[PDB]
Amino acid sequence: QTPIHVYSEIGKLKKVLLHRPGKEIENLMPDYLERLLFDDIPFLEDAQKEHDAFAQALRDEGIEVLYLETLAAESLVTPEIREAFIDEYLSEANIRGRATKKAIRELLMAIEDNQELIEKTMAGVQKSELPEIPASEKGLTDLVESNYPFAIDPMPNLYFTRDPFATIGTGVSLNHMFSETRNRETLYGKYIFTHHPIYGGGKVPMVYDRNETTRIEGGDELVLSKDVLAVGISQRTDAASIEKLLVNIFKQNLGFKKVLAFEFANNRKFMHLDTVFTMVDYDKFTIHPEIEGDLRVYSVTYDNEELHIVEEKGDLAELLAANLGVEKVDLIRCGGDNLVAAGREQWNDGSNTLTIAPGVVVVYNRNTITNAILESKGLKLIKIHGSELVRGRGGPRCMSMPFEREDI
Amino acid sequence: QTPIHVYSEIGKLKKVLLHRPGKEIENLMPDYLERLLFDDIPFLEDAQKEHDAFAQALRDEGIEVLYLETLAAESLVTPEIREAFIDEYLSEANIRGRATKKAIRELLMAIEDNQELIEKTMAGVQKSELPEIPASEKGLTDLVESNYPFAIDPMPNLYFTRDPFATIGTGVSLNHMFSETRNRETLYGKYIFTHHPIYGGGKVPMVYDRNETTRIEGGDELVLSKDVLAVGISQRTDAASIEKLLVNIFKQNLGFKKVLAFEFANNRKFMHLDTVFTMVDYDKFTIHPEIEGDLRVYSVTYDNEELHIVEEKGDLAELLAANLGVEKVDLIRCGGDNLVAAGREQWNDGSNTLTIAPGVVVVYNRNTITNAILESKGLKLIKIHGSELVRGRGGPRCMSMPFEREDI
C-alpha cells in the first residue's frame, strides 16, 4: 500500500482532500475582488454550511474527508518545523515594511494551537490587528502609509483544493500557479508532502515542484486511466510544464504510458481543461460544446528515454474510446442544445463534475439542464447547494482533490 | 381616497409593489453581464423561492403585495391598448432587422393571456425562438449575422421596482433612467399609470414623465415626511430633473413644502442616495460612513412660484432633526467600526434598509454587523435570505416600491 493511490477520475472515491472556508472569505472586500479571483463576496456562515453539507454528502457515500488545514497542522511535527513554516509564510506574504513583518512574526509565534496558526496564515492579517509602530522603529516602506486595509492578503481560493497540487498514481504534482495570490497556497502542500507523518518523508513521490519556473495548475491535470493522462495546454498551464511533468512521471516509473495533451492555450475564456471536459463514467464525458471547434489533441509518449509527439487529427470521441479501450464514447453537452443555457451552466461549473464512482456524480443544484441530461443518460446525481461556494467560480470537482480511488 | 398614499419612508406599510424574477434572469450570459447590469448569474428557481419568502414575510405583517407584471397585464384593458403596448415595446427593443421585428410581433400577438404576454416582453427573445426567415424576405440588417444570441435583450433588473418609478404623496414620479437600456423598464409604469382601472385614468398625478429629457432614478427619491422630500444629485440623477420634479410637485399641489437636495454627483462609487442614506425610525437613519465628508445639502423651496435654494452647511443630524421636528437624530453607521465589514456590508446594501413601520426593518440575513447595530438600537428586524437576489446588487428597499403607508 501507499498513502496516495489515484489511477482514474471515475474510480470509487475512498479519500478526498477538502478545505473548509475560514476567515479568508471574510477578509474579502469589493475593490480587491478581480485579483483575489472572486466574482462576488460570499456570506461565510452560509458558505461554511454549504461546504459542510458537501463534505457530509461525500461521507454518506463512504468517503473519508481529509482537511487541508488539519493535514498542514499535523506537518508542524517539531517547534523548528513550526518556526520554519512561519518564516517561509512571511517571506512569501509580500509584507510592506520590516517593522510590520516583525510585528506579525510575534503575533503568529503567540498562536499555541497548530491548526489555529495554520488557519490564521490562510486568513491573512488586517492592519487594524497590529499595534501602532512608533516613528523611531519605522523603516522606509513602513513610512509609506496607504489606505489598503491588509498587512497580509487572505488566500480566499483555498477551498478550491483542485489546483495547488494534484495526485497522479502514487505521486503528487506540487504546482506553480499562474497568479501569485494563488501560488502562496502551494506552501501548505510543500509542508504536507515533506513533513506530514503519513504524506511526508519521501513516502509520496513528487512529479512537479513549486520552485519550478513554468506554470501548471491541477485543473488541467486529468488521470483518465492507469495508462493515460489528460492535460490541457491552457492560459494557466505552460506547455513546458507538461513535458517536465511527463519526464518526471516516467522517471518515477508511475506506470502512465501516454499523455493526451489538449491544446486550447489561445482560448482565454476557459481557464482549465476541467472547466470544459471531465470524465463521468467508463465511456462518458461532460464537455462544453464551444471547445470542439478550436481543439488540438496530441499523443505524447516517452520512448528510448526521449519524448515523442503525434497530433491526433481524428474525432475526439473516437480518440478517447481507442485510448480508454471502450467501443464508443458519449460526449454529453453541458446545457444541452440551447446556447444561452450552455453559457449560463458552463459559468456555474456545469461541465466540472466530481465523479465519486462510475456514473455517480456530485453536482450543483443550479445546473438544472445539465443535471437533467446526465440523469437521462442513466447517471446517479448527488445534488448539493452551492449558492455561496459558486461565487468563487468553481464547482464540486474544483473544491476537491482525491487522495485514494478504487482501481478499475 | 386615492389609490397612491405615500407621505413617509417609515409609516406602516399597507401596499407595496414587487416584481417576481422571471425568465429575464435565465436569459443572462457571462459575456454580456456588461451590456446588461448584473454582478453574477442567479439561479432563477432559488431567486423565485427567496422573493416569494420576502413577499410572504411582508404579507405576514399585514401588507398587500402587488406585482408589476400583474398590474401591467391589468392595464391592457382593450385589444387596441394591448396592440399599442406591443408596438411601443418593439420600438424600444432595439431589434436588428425589419423581418426579425415582424416575426416577434407575430410571436407576441399569439400570446392570448395578458400576464403571459407581459412576462415574455420582460424576458426578451432568443434568436433560437424565431422561425427561419427566407433570404427573399430578409433586409440588410437581417442578413448581417452575428453570434449574439438575443433578438430582444432581457430586462434582468426588473425585480428592483425602486428605480423606474417612485410614489410621492398621491402622485408618481415616472422616471427617465440614466442608461437608455435600463429605461426600457419604465414602459410598464407608463401603461399602469395611464390605463390601469385603479392606477390609470389620471387617478395618479404624474410629477415626472419618462419622455422627459433629464435623468432621475427612484433610488434618489426619499419621502421623509408630508412636508419634506430628500432627493439625491448623483451619477444617475441630473440636478435639472430635481428642479423639474419640485416645480411639478408644488404645481400638482402634492403638499410638500421643502426638498433637501443631497449633492454627491462627484462620488462615482455610490449610484443613488438610498445606497448610503435611509430613514428607519422617527429619529433614526442608516448611513454609509464615507459620505459625511463630501456631502453638500441644499434646502430647495418654491416660494412665490420661483425656486429658492439655501445651502445647509451645518451638522447633518442637526439639520435632519430640525426638518423632521424631532429633538435629536441618530445616524447609524453601516457595518460598524471594522473597515472590512463596512466595505462588505455596504456592497450587500447595508445602508438601504426597507422600513415597513417605525423601527421595523426588512434586512438581508448576511449583513450581520449592520443587523446587530439596528437590533442594539431597539429595532425589530425581519431577516430574509437573499443569496440569489443580492447578485443584482440590491437589497429589500431596492426590490420594493410602496403604494400606501399610514400617516405619521
PDB file of N, CA and C in Angstrom, chain A residues 85-135:
ATOM      1  N   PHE A  85       8.094  27.155   9.014  1.00  0.00           N
ATOM      2  CA  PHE A  85       6.834  27.444   8.326  1.00  0.00           C
ATOM      3  C   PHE A  85       6.473  28.922   8.457  1.00  0.00           C
ATOM      4  N   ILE A  86       6.493  29.473   9.685  1.00  0.00           N
ATOM      5  CA  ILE A  86       6.154  30.875   9.955  1.00  0.00           C
ATOM      6  C   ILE A  86       7.039  31.808   9.102  1.00  0.00           C
ATOM      7  N   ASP A  87       8.355  31.569   9.099  1.00  0.00           N
ATOM      8  CA  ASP A  87       9.319  32.370   8.359  1.00  0.00           C
ATOM      9  C   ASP A  87       9.160  32.247   6.830  1.00  0.00           C
ATOM     10  N   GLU A  88       8.833  31.043   6.322  1.00  0.00           N
ATOM     11  CA  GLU A  88       8.625  30.825   4.894  1.00  0.00           C
ATOM     12  C   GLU A  88       7.328  31.525   4.456  1.00  0.00           C
ATOM     13  N   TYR A  89       6.270  31.448   5.293  1.00  0.00           N
ATOM     14  CA  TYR A  89       4.982  32.095   5.056  1.00  0.00           C
ATOM     15  C   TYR A  89       5.173  33.612   4.957  1.00  0.00           C
ATOM     16  N   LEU A  90       5.926  34.201   5.907  1.00  0.00           N
ATOM     17  CA  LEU A  90       6.195  35.642   5.947  1.00  0.00           C
ATOM     18  C   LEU A  90       7.020  36.117   4.739  1.00  0.00           C
ATOM     19  N   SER A  91       7.980  35.296   4.273  1.00  0.00           N
ATOM     20  CA  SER A  91       8.827  35.656   3.134  1.00  0.00           C
ATOM     21  C   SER A  91       8.020  35.696   1.822  1.00  0.00           C
ATOM     22  N   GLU A  92       6.903  34.956   1.759  1.00  0.00           N
ATOM     23  CA  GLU A  92       6.021  34.893   0.593  1.00  0.00           C
ATOM     24  C   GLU A  92       4.757  35.765   0.755  1.00  0.00           C
ATOM     25  N   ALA A  93       4.588  36.420   1.920  1.00  0.00           N
ATOM     26  CA  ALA A  93       3.393  37.199   2.253  1.00  0.00           C
ATOM     27  C   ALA A  93       3.356  38.604   1.651  1.00  0.00           C
ATOM     28  N   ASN A  94       4.434  39.052   1.006  1.00  0.00           N
ATOM     29  CA  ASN A  94       4.560  40.382   0.385  1.00  0.00           C
ATOM     30  C   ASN A  94       4.222  41.504   1.398  1.00  0.00           C
ATOM     31  N   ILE A  95       4.828  41.430   2.596  1.00  0.00           N
ATOM     32  CA  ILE A  95       4.655  42.419   3.654  1.00  0.00           C
ATOM     33  C   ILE A  95       5.435  43.694   3.304  1.00  0.00           C
ATOM     34  N   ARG A  96       4.759  44.844   3.414  1.00  0.00           N
ATOM     35  CA  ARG A  96       5.341  46.152   3.167  1.00  0.00           C
ATOM     36  C   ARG A  96       5.864  46.706   4.495  1.00  0.00           C
ATOM     37  N   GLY A  97       7.189  46.754   4.620  1.00  0.00           N
ATOM     38  CA  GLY A  97       7.866  47.240   5.819  1.00  0.00           C
ATOM     39  C   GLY A  97       8.409  46.136   6.706  1.00  0.00           C
ATOM     40  N   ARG A  98       9.639  46.346   7.245  1.00  0.00           N
ATOM     41  CA  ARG A  98      10.360  45.433   8.156  1.00  0.00           C
ATOM     42  C   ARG A  98       9.679  45.304   9.517  1.00  0.00           C
ATOM     43  N   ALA A  99       9.191  46.441  10.077  1.00  0.00           N
ATOM     44  CA  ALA A  99       8.548  46.512  11.392  1.00  0.00           C
ATOM     45  C   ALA A  99       7.210  45.811  11.397  1.00  0.00           C
ATOM     46  N   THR A 100       6.486  45.843  10.261  1.00  0.00           N
ATOM     47  CA  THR A 100       5.189  45.175  10.112  1.00  0.00           C
ATOM     48  C   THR A 100       5.430  43.648  10.091  1.00  0.00           C
ATOM     49  N   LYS A 101       6.455  43.172   9.342  1.00  0.00           N
ATOM     50  CA  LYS A 101       6.863  41.756   9.246  1.00  0.00           C
ATOM     51  C   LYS A 101       7.249  41.207  10.640  1.00  0.00           C
ATOM     52  N   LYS A 102       7.949  42.030  11.435  1.00  0.00           N
ATOM     53  CA  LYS A 102       8.382  41.708  12.794  1.00  0.00           C
ATOM     54  C   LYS A 102       7.170  41.577  13.736  1.00  0.00           C
ATOM     55  N   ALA A 103       6.215  42.532  13.670  1.00  0.00           N
ATOM     56  CA  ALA A 103       5.000  42.523  14.496  1.00  0.00           C
ATOM     57  C   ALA A 103       4.147  41.277  14.225  1.00  0.00           C
ATOM     58  N   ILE A 104       4.013  40.901  12.935  1.00  0.00           N
ATOM     59  CA  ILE A 104       3.235  39.734  12.506  1.00  0.00           C
ATOM     60  C   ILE A 104       3.948  38.446  12.987  1.00  0.00           C
ATOM     61  N   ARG A 105       5.289  38.401  12.923  1.00  0.00           N
ATOM     62  CA  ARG A 105       6.023  37.231  13.406  1.00  0.00           C
ATOM     63  C   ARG A 105       5.693  36.983  14.889  1.00  0.00           C
ATOM     64  N   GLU A 106       5.682  38.049  15.720  1.00  0.00           N
ATOM     65  CA  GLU A 106       5.346  37.980  17.155  1.00  0.00           C
ATOM     66  C   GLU A 106       3.911  37.451  17.359  1.00  0.00           C
ATOM     67  N   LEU A 107       2.959  37.970  16.563  1.00  0.00           N
ATOM     68  CA  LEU A 107       1.546  37.602  16.564  1.00  0.00           C
ATOM     69  C   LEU A 107       1.358  36.092  16.303  1.00  0.00           C
ATOM     70  N   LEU A 108       1.990  35.568  15.244  1.00  0.00           N
ATOM     71  CA  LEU A 108       1.897  34.165  14.822  1.00  0.00           C
ATOM     72  C   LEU A 108       2.595  33.245  15.794  1.00  0.00           C
ATOM     73  N   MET A 109       3.742  33.681  16.357  1.00  0.00           N
ATOM     74  CA  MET A 109       4.507  32.895  17.329  1.00  0.00           C
ATOM     75  C   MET A 109       3.708  32.673  18.606  1.00  0.00           C
ATOM     76  N   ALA A 110       2.780  33.595  18.922  1.00  0.00           N
ATOM     77  CA  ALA A 110       1.914  33.547  20.102  1.00  0.00           C
ATOM     78  C   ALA A 110       0.741  32.554  19.951  1.00  0.00           C
ATOM     79  N   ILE A 111       0.440  32.099  18.721  1.00  0.00           N
ATOM     80  CA  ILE A 111      -0.669  31.159  18.499  1.00  0.00           C
ATOM     81  C   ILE A 111      -0.173  29.741  18.844  1.00  0.00           C
ATOM     82  N   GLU A 112      -0.627  29.233  20.002  1.00  0.00           N
ATOM     83  CA  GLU A 112      -0.237  27.940  20.581  1.00  0.00           C
ATOM     84  C   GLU A 112      -0.740  26.732  19.792  1.00  0.00           C
ATOM     85  N   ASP A 113      -2.032  26.712  19.401  1.00  0.00           N
ATOM     86  CA  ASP A 113      -2.615  25.594  18.649  1.00  0.00           C
ATOM     87  C   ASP A 113      -2.183  25.685  17.179  1.00  0.00           C
ATOM     88  N   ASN A 114      -1.605  24.587  16.654  1.00  0.00           N
ATOM     89  CA  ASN A 114      -1.093  24.486  15.286  1.00  0.00           C
ATOM     90  C   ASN A 114      -2.152  24.732  14.211  1.00  0.00           C
ATOM     91  N   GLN A 115      -3.379  24.175  14.364  1.00  0.00           N
ATOM     92  CA  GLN A 115      -4.434  24.381  13.370  1.00  0.00           C
ATOM     93  C   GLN A 115      -4.904  25.827  13.390  1.00  0.00           C
ATOM     94  N   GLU A 116      -4.980  26.432  14.601  1.00  0.00           N
ATOM     95  CA  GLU A 116      -5.355  27.840  14.781  1.00  0.00           C
ATOM     96  C   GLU A 116      -4.327  28.734  14.043  1.00  0.00           C
ATOM     97  N   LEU A 117      -3.021  28.365  14.133  1.00  0.00           N
ATOM     98  CA  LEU A 117      -1.908  29.036  13.468  1.00  0.00           C
ATOM     99  C   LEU A 117      -2.043  28.924  11.946  1.00  0.00           C
ATOM    100  N   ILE A 118      -2.261  27.696  11.426  1.00  0.00           N
ATOM    101  CA  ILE A 118      -2.417  27.417  10.000  1.00  0.00           C
ATOM    102  C   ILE A 118      -3.557  28.263   9.447  1.00  0.00           C
ATOM    103  N   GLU A 119      -4.738  28.215  10.116  1.00  0.00           N
ATOM    104  CA  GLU A 119      -5.949  28.952   9.730  1.00  0.00           C
ATOM    105  C   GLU A 119      -5.711  30.472   9.685  1.00  0.00           C
ATOM    106  N   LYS A 120      -4.913  31.027  10.613  1.00  0.00           N
ATOM    107  CA  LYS A 120      -4.569  32.446  10.625  1.00  0.00           C
ATOM    108  C   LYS A 120      -3.690  32.822   9.397  1.00  0.00           C
ATOM    109  N   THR A 121      -2.755  31.935   9.005  1.00  0.00           N
ATOM    110  CA  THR A 121      -1.892  32.197   7.843  1.00  0.00           C
ATOM    111  C   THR A 121      -2.740  32.170   6.564  1.00  0.00           C
ATOM    112  N   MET A 122      -3.782  31.340   6.555  1.00  0.00           N
ATOM    113  CA  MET A 122      -4.725  31.230   5.428  1.00  0.00           C
ATOM    114  C   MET A 122      -5.609  32.494   5.323  1.00  0.00           C
ATOM    115  N   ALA A 123      -6.033  33.040   6.486  1.00  0.00           N
ATOM    116  CA  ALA A 123      -6.912  34.204   6.612  1.00  0.00           C
ATOM    117  C   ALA A 123      -6.211  35.534   6.276  1.00  0.00           C
ATOM    118  N   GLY A 124      -4.904  35.614   6.492  1.00  0.00           N
ATOM    119  CA  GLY A 124      -4.161  36.855   6.292  1.00  0.00           C
ATOM    120  C   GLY A 124      -4.225  37.705   7.549  1.00  0.00           C
ATOM    121  N   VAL A 125      -3.745  38.969   7.474  1.00  0.00           N
ATOM    122  CA  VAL A 125      -3.695  39.897   8.626  1.00  0.00           C
ATOM    123  C   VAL A 125      -4.168  41.291   8.210  1.00  0.00           C
ATOM    124  N   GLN A 126      -5.152  41.839   8.935  1.00  0.00           N
ATOM    125  CA  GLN A 126      -5.631  43.210   8.749  1.00  0.00           C
ATOM    126  C   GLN A 126      -4.675  44.147   9.479  1.00  0.00           C
ATOM    127  N   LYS A 127      -4.462  45.367   8.965  1.00  0.00           N
ATOM    128  CA  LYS A 127      -3.579  46.349   9.606  1.00  0.00           C
ATOM    129  C   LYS A 127      -4.114  46.743  10.992  1.00  0.00           C
ATOM    130  N   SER A 128      -5.462  46.754  11.146  1.00  0.00           N
ATOM    131  CA  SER A 128      -6.162  47.070  12.397  1.00  0.00           C
ATOM    132  C   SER A 128      -5.800  46.098  13.544  1.00  0.00           C
ATOM    133  N   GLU A 129      -5.375  44.861  13.204  1.00  0.00           N
ATOM    134  CA  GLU A 129      -4.978  43.807  14.152  1.00  0.00           C
ATOM    135  C   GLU A 129      -3.608  44.043  14.772  1.00  0.00           C
ATOM    136  N   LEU A 130      -2.812  44.925  14.169  1.00  0.00           N
ATOM    137  CA  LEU A 130      -1.439  45.168  14.592  1.00  0.00           C
ATOM    138  C   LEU A 130      -1.281  46.430  15.447  1.00  0.00           C
ATOM    139  N   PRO A 131      -0.373  46.411  16.452  1.00  0.00           N
ATOM    140  CA  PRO A 131      -0.151  47.623  17.260  1.00  0.00           C
ATOM    141  C   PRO A 131       0.469  48.768  16.452  1.00  0.00           C
ATOM    142  N   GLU A 132       0.326  50.004  16.962  1.00  0.00           N
ATOM    143  CA  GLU A 132       0.883  51.178  16.289  1.00  0.00           C
ATOM    144  C   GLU A 132       2.391  51.191  16.475  1.00  0.00           C
ATOM    145  N   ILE A 133       3.125  51.238  15.358  1.00  0.00           N
ATOM    146  CA  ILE A 133       4.582  51.245  15.362  1.00  0.00           C
ATOM    147  C   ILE A 133       5.068  52.688  15.574  1.00  0.00           C
ATOM    148  N   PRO A 134       5.907  52.956  16.605  1.00  0.00           N
ATOM    149  CA  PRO A 134       6.430  54.323  16.778  1.00  0.00           C
ATOM    150  C   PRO A 134       7.367  54.692  15.627  1.00  0.00           C
ATOM    151  N   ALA A 135       7.346  55.975  15.200  1.00  0.00           N
ATOM    152  CA  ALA A 135       8.151  56.527  14.099  1.00  0.00           C
ATOM    153  C   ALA A 135       9.629  56.097  14.158  1.00  0.00           C
TER     154      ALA A 135
END
